[PDB]
Symmetry: C3
């Protein structure tokens, strides 16, 4: 059994909690959603226990220090594919955070809310603000920029790509 | 979108946790009840614009709670809860909970919430209270206590049957958005 | 109504969280299990009213910022070990009994053997034999309970719901009827 600690980081409202709830319980939350999902684990794969940690705000101001204690093995940096602000924060904030608190450990870059990237209403609302969803090549390029071992897109709502995210988190630690 | 932090305070066993679980999940708990419901939030639309309503349950007195839920981060509105069928919980609104909110959340609105409305005018809860020379708290008494502590509203509800529950949280938002 | 604080302690992976989930919800968890079930209580009638508060734990008390064994005061503790992990059984004497004695002196202990469903699962017994191990027997468990001064020894399975209700019934009785 190899234990692994996987922490999910990123801006508020990108879908970190929903990612974890959908994957761990196969249910998508209702309108009231936990702010921070509790720590869960599974024994999966080869012999592996995958420990999953949700986060609140920036590590430095979180009394629980989920990114630092105990030691993190792999980080999922999440941004919403329909929030360009949240993508820019990968570079401004989240890659710096993981490098600072978890130096020399693998990062997976995860674009969330894949289902909304072709949602008519979502695209229109963005267009009204002179914005457009983040594309696959853009995400891939950000992943290369920050030294992420994988770029993955998913929807917690439809579960498209969701299983691959957590399989790759494990592979990043087991098969570096 | 304005974020609103709403904290639920009051004596043990008044129904704070059940108030939150019933509202957020539309189910009333079974035999085993969490002591303190985790933090949940919702994106709500109120007369035009998006609000995120964050709900916090509490354990005991703030000063001895290492989590300090009433203080961190800053609370926008407090629900002081007492059970309509526990006069002692009601007296503690004046002895404990109003002083607590005034101390830790100065100059923020209070809603006074009478819980367990489904028991107030009965099951023969009335007869069991009478054995002890006690009587359920009446609406006028609750209203008077709300005035005394400067609460912006007094509301009665049942988590069990959901009587009046949605109004509690609608009014909590309105107290912050419409001071 | 008497409030009772019951804390569940023992090695990682013995089945503490599952014990608590299965009992309180009558169903065994999926592949994804909370590391530490949140604090729950129930109002229960035993003989002539009790509130039984249940606390799950993580690692050793002294390094757990939450200090569940110490704060507030514990009335009874369940020391758990897996019937198919001899190492976890040895840690009853090396670790868990000393922990409860240090942080909760002069309070009752119930010793609980978990994963009773495996004590005869061939995949498990054979794999144990390969490592020169054998599942813990009832007499061994009983002897350890005597050694550590536990007021009861109980065996259970969260997976099948064998013996679960008895664990919590006896937890109550240990405080109510000392
Ligand atoms: N359409 C869609 N909405 C999502 C998805 N994941 C999260 N959301 C919504 O995005 C908002 C924030 O989700 P949450 O998981 O609480 O984000 P967090 O702050 O990063 O934890 C909520 O309104 C969710 O319902 C998704 O995959 N698809
Ligand atoms: N009849 C009735 N009982 C309730 C109601 N809400 C809570 N309770 C019960 O009151 C007890 C305490 O509830 P809880 O929510 O845990 O109280 P807290 O300590 O204030 O969180 C439990 O036995 C609940 O079942 C209600 O609306 N009606
Ligand atoms: N076969 C069997 N497995 C169990 C039982 N209880 C827990 N487990 C498994 O043992 C592992 C650890 O359980 P958990 O409750 O998380 O252990 P804890 O670390 O002590 O809380 C998980 O793989 C569970 O599915 C049981 O009664 N029987
Ligand atoms: Zn969240
Ligand atoms: Zn930092
Ligand atoms: Zn438009
Ligand atoms: Zn509660
Ligand atoms: Zn929790
Ligand atoms: Zn105070
Ligand atoms: Zn556990
Ligand atoms: Zn210790």
């Amino acid at each position: 059994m190899q234990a692994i600690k996987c922490v999910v980081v990123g801006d508020g409202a990108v879908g970190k909690t929903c990612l974890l709830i959908s994957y761990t319980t196969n249910a998508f939350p209702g309108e009231y959603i936990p702010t921070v999902f509790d720590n869960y684990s599974a024994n999966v794969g080869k012999p592996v226990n995958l420990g999953l940690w949700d986060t609140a705000g920036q590590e430095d101001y979180d009394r629980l220090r989920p990114l630092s204690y105990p030691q993190t093995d792999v980080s999922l940096i999440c941004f919403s594919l329909v929030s360009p602000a949240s993508f820019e924060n990968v570079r401004a904030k989240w890659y710096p955070e993981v490098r600072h608190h978890c130096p020399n450990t693998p990062i997976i870059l995860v674009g969330t809310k894949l289902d909304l990237r072709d949602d008519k209403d979502t695209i229109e609302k963005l267009k009204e603000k002179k914005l457009t969803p983040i594309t696959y090549p853009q995400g891939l390029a950000m992943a290369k920029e920050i030294g992420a071992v994988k770029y993955l897109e998913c929807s917690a709502l439809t579960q498209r790509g969701l299983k691959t995210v957590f399989d790759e988190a494990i592979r990043a630690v087991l098969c570096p």
